[PDB]
């Protein structure tokens, strides 16, 4: 498959952002759309998660308040809102669709595709 | 605590109990009452002269030995202490 | 946490490993997944579900799991092996949590 | 010697326990999660 996801932006701080990214390739349905943070000087840090086929999201504990996964079925693009922008929230926002995999003994997940898309504030 | 506290509690209950005794034994009769929630009458049969019923059947008596005050919440026991108490011989 | 080595050191030809370490309720009850992520570029899966390989990945790469901790070993380490690897893994505390490690710069000595 | 410490631990991991009392008996509200896999309708 195949996530494309939105250009650049740069805004300053407190103005609430808009990244998103259009899936291609698979029913957007069935899999669902996991948001992940990457600080240039640091490591990746799970945004938060929700699916699409009942809009339930899963945001981390450290984004309770601040971020906004909604999606559109129709055209099969799924985007965050992220608010009250500080210094330290510039970082490259990857959205990874999140493979599962259930039998009898439990479940495996997993990031499968992942996509790119930076930000700047 | 109060898990401690009832697990306590329960064993005090239960020590020195006689299953073989009804509650009251030389005393007044014990008043059982009895719910049914009929759950499903599955199959009327002509044939065998039968039907069967699916219930939940439900007996409540007063059984003073089984009595308790250090704690104030309506207790839920495993099933498997039903072995060790006393129950009506009730027979369909 | 996910904590895992800052760095690793390997050169070519030698068999070196990746180590994380977290709680019994992410890597002990849930399966560990590494993502590769070459320099300049986005992270792509490597392992899933502590041993599987998706199509494309070679089986120089291998994924082990002990108790609470998993080790990725990188046999046959080659130039292009050079990038940083993260481990994730779901937690069971919330409903929905993964943790991704910190992450590890291999580099390739010479 | 292995084996000395996994005997150790599953001796030691009743003691004391009343399997007649739910987890959290008064304290909590035991969550359960369930989850099923439906090997054939
Ligand atoms: C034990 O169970 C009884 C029976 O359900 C509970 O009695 C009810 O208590 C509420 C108040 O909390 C009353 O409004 C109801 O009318 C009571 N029903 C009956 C049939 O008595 C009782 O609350 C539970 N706990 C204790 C401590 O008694």
């Known amino acids: 498959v195949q996530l494309v996801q939105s250009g650049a932006e740069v805004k300053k701080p407190g103005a609430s952002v808009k990244v998103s990214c259009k899936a291609s390739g698979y029913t957007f349905i069935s899999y669902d759309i996991n948001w992940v943070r990457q600080a240039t000087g640091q490591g990746l840090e799970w945004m938060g998660g929700?699916?699409?086929?009942?809009?339930?999201?899963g945001y981390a504990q450290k984004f309770q308040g601040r971020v906004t996964m909604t999606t559109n079925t129709a055209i099969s693009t799924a985007y965050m809102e992220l608010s009250s922008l500080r210094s330290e929230d510039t970082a490259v926002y990857y959205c990874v669709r999140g493979e599962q995999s259930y039998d009898r003994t439990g479940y495996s997940d997993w990031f499968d595709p992942w996509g790119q898309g930076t930000l700047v504030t | 605590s109060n898990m401690s506290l009832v697990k306590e509690t329960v064993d005090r209950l239960l020590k020195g109990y006689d299953i073989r005794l009804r509650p009251d034994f030389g005393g007044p009769p014990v008043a059982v009452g009895m719910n049914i929630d009929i759950a499903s009458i599955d199959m009327v049969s002509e044939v065998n002269m039968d039907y069967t019923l699916t219930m939940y059947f439900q007996q409540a008596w007063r059984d003073k030995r089984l009595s308790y005050n250090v704690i104030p919440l309506n207790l839920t026991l495993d099933n498997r202490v039903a072995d060790q108490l006393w129950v009506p011989d009730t027979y369909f | 946490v996910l904590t895992q080595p800052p760095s690793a050191s390997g050169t070519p030809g030698q068999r070196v490993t990746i180590s994380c370490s977290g709680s019994s309720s992410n890597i002990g009850s849930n399966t560990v997944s590494w993502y590769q992520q070459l320099p300049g570029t986005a992270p792509k899966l490597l392992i899933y579900?502590?041993?599987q390989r998706p199509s494309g990945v070679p089986d120089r790469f291998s994924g082990s799991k002990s108790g609470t901790s998993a080790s990725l070993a990188i046999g046959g380490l080659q130039s292009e092996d050079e990038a940083d690897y993260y481990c994730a893994a779901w937690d069971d505390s919330l409903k929905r949590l993964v943790v991704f490690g910190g992450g590890t710069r291999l580099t390739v000595l010479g | 010697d292995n084996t000395t410490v996994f005997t150790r631990i599953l001796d030691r991991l009743l003691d004391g326990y009343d399997n007649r009392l739910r987890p959290g008996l008064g304290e909590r509200v035991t969550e359960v999660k369930t989850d099923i896999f439906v090997t054939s309708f």
């Open positions: 579900s502590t041993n």
């Open positions: 929700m699916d699409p086929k009942s809009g339930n999201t």
